[PDB]
């Protein structure tokens, strides 16, 4: 029996669906799109080329080797595309799969995309919706973060880097957006804090919720971390395309010139 | 050390410190497997590593770790311990402990219970000594109970009166009076303090011998009745009635008195049926009359020094006696072979009350073991922490020689070549004592520290020649550092032109005077000119070693550069004492004349807590004046205690940092006036 | 000063329980030549320590965490204090030595509103951009993203060591237990099995994130050897006018 083809198609349909229809319904009820919808809106129609669709995580601890804990893609969709004819590299984090927590494979995919971007000389756009670091993955997860960090520092001043926070972001998932040139957020749905409010109450003992501890208003008015805040996902992506039209593709290229009237 | 002789196979040491190391050493030499008990704090101590295996006893405090008989006995039972050595202190004289040992099967390396209880109580010890027809101090038999009885005793025995609380020891519960009113007030104070200190509340009037010499006779007894007196030792040098300097061959005492005291000690030991090792202390007046004072029923702390003259290992003899073998030596065999001197190195400041127990962690520790005729009994290794729960011991330094002068010279050299960095030690006090004219001549007593230093220890008073040598060495060290600072590696892009300065004109500010020094270099020899005097200083000038040896006009001196700063301050140890100097260039001094003094009174009226935590200790009270930089309160946070202080002399308006208060960071604690 | 001098006094300077603190300046003094240390900003942001010293006669820059002040947690002031010192040491070819004991970043609302993310990224960038030799020694805790910041091997670090008291983990064992085994709700042996395999430097060592688990007494000698091997280090980076540090 030629089960390889049906296995390939089942893996494709599982990756395209993230981690389940119920979780996608929960994501939509929160007012948030999925990673693939975000990429479809951001890029030109019929220009997305995806990389590492079938990559799976190698963790085999705490019952993470069971088939119910094997999601292809591993909570990140990476690839390349074009905006108004100009090449760009993109990664979007899927909150459906393990809350978007970064494991080894996640870091490998992001670093692979960033390495191609630094080799060719094209910008990187990253949509962050990670719930922190995958605890089951262990120190490996930490290592992955550092790898990404290094590449960011290596790509500073060589290619433009843009970050858009479209969901919660905590723990060490905050340094990479800070190392990029520009950071944008989505109002009422995006968060950015090193430490969660519960630990804040536990340690320094005051009542604060997520909204005024890491919300877009807080990080766009009184912290200076983010650069702009947009109404929702569609508006954010349209404004991101408009902004990307301005920048050059590499430090070697001169300032872009359009047609003037 | 006969391996054929089959003694016990396993021995448990029930003590901590250098004594545990001593017992482990002699057991490893003699072949016995050794198991060592340790608290949680001392889990990395020297004796734990030295022992074959170790068993933890429990919490840090001594009352809970080494004084817990149940833990000791379970440790013995688990490890199949055959014999036990208590050392000195802790359960050395514990009656119920030995009762439990005799109950199960356990042999005790030490005297029997009868001797322990006979010599434990001072009154019954004196009574037995009277029954032992040995010379005793003049006193009234019985326990004084009322002031009138005490003053009457003072009447018949004479105005010099000393009240001693029965039992206990360690220079406690003893008051000296000279008048009947002094007799009664000392009596009432002693009665009040006996319950707090000892609890026996039994008090004894005794006659105070004037300037006694505290001689001690080491005695070795076996189970077959053979008692031997192994020479003598002198421990006149005391502070707080505690021994510091200890001489094995007595110089004041002579052969006839030695024989008489040995015979008396042996007779009393036979009377007590003492079948182990111990010591008997005697007080000798100016007229060579010796009076009994206490018999130790344990291994004496200053045993090693006599081991240098007799040539015997006391602990090995104790083990053999505990086995049951008769003594292998006779009264004739023992001889006085040379001279031996011991100094007890404590971790205490000799500049305050002749030693105030300090704490700290040793960043550097090097013993002078390479010097000839030096023995170091220590339980200290680099990194060891001096705690508050234990006797602030550092080590015991012993020198042996042909005669007294050689031993004293070797002690001086060893003390000069001894490196302790991390706490405050009393090395300066020891070295200054051993070079005193009175000590060298031999006119010493129990008041040596008091009469020699009425104002207290002040350090070595250096003479004009010593001052010149110190200034020359300091200037030479300064110039050597400056010259070393110019030895960069070759750059080949911007070549370095080394300055060709020939003479250095420096101003050195020792104590308060200012001296003009002119120094020149001709390689390894510095020609120094201090206030007219001309000196030559030579050395290898190794600026990194802790100990630096320099020859000044032939005289060899070992010095340590404890501290050095770019501003000119230099703290250097010379002849035991740490001197602070300030060396500047001549132009630097001339310009510094313009700089105005900064008065350091500060205000610090509103003092704030460092970090949020509970205040364990409060050193101030409202209405009490403080000083500049005076300790205010000790606060613990994350069980880390910080002792935060004040900044200026001011009366405390109110203490908000009371004990137990969980004051937060930057909170008002004490207000100063 | 011999480059192979032993430092046994460091063998027990780290308390075995995790609640007491210790002075890392003591370790720095023990390691360096002649115990001479020129500290920079010694009274400001005292939870981090930076300074100049010498190893085998060669100038070295030293950065470390101070567990006495604020338990070693990183904050804005310490991050900006360390970042520029690291940048200056890199710019003028001065090797860097790091002593790592950090439980994480200091929490609170004031830190979040002050922009702790930007200032932490400053230090992360400063360590990642270094092209001079870098030696790192972990004395105890290295928890979370702080472990990434404090000169990790993953940031193109050269040589990393760990003392037998080191502990590299995403977080403390406790919170990791309540977060991983939340469903099991029975931790009496779960905590024991977690701390027996993760509350030690083995997870970091077996993945090669540290080159060796050295003894504290052999620190200085080891470092000296590295500084004689890494003196001729040269790396190449992509061309740029300048990089956009998160200033
Ligand atoms: C001393 C050093 C340190 O402090 S280490 C800090 C690391 N500790 C963390 O918890 C990571 C930080 N993450 C978070 O705080 C929260 O996840 C935040 C970011 C607030 C997300 O908010 P929230 O929308 O309520 O998440 P959620 O409960 O709806 O999502 C549940 C799914 O996400 C997953 N998830 C979350 N965090 C982790 C994690 N650290 N490791 C592994 N998985 C994580 C949950 O497992 C859960 O999985 P699933 O997707 O439902 O299958
Ligand atoms: N009768 C006395 N005449 C003169 N001096 C005395 C007399 N009794 C005690 N002293 C002085 O007091 C010191 C302490 O003596 P003693 O050995 O009794 O003290 P202790 O604290 O009981 O000792 P230990 O720790 O050995 O039990 C002696 O060294 C001596 O200087
Ligand atoms: Mg006595």
Walk me through what this model shows.
The complex is a heterotrimer of chains A (261), B (673) and C (247). Chain A has 261 residues and is of the alpha/beta class. Chain A is 38% helix and 14% strand. Chain A has 10 helices and 7 strands. A 7-stranded mixed beta sheet of chain A has the order 1-2-3-4-5-6-7, with helices on both faces. In chain A, α5 links the parallel β4 and β5. In chain A, α4 runs parallel beside α5 (139-155). Chain A is globular. In chain B, α8 (147-157) crosses α9 (180-197). With 673 residues, chain B is α+β, with helices and mostly antiparallel strands. Helices cover 27% and strands 28% of the residues of chain B. Chain B contains 18 helices and 39 strands. Chain B folds into 5 domains: 4-136, no CATH class; 137-208, no CATH class; 209-446, no CATH class; 447-595, no CATH class; 596-673, no CATH class. Chain B has an 8-stranded antiparallel beta barrel with strand order 26-27-28-29-30-31-32-33. In chain B, strands 3-2-1-4-5 form a 5-stranded parallel beta sheet, with helices on both faces. Chain C starts with 23 loop residues before the first helix and ends in an 18-residue tail after the last helix. The chains are: A alpha/beta (261), B alpha+beta (673), C alpha/beta (247). Chains in contact: A-C, B-C. The interface between A and C is large, with 48 and 50 residues. The structure holds propionyl Coenzyme A (1VU), adenosine-5'-triphosphate and magnesium ion. Adenosine-5'-triphosphate (ATP) binds next to β15 and β16 of chain B. Chain A: Residues 1-259 form the CoA carboxyltransferase N-terminal domain. Chain A: This is Propionyl-CoA carboxylase beta chain, mitochondrial. Chain A: Belongs to the AccD/PCCB family. Chain A: The modification N6-acetyllysine is found at residue 68. Chain A: It is found in: Mitochondrion matrix. Chain B: Its cofactor is Mg(2+); Mn(2+); biotin.
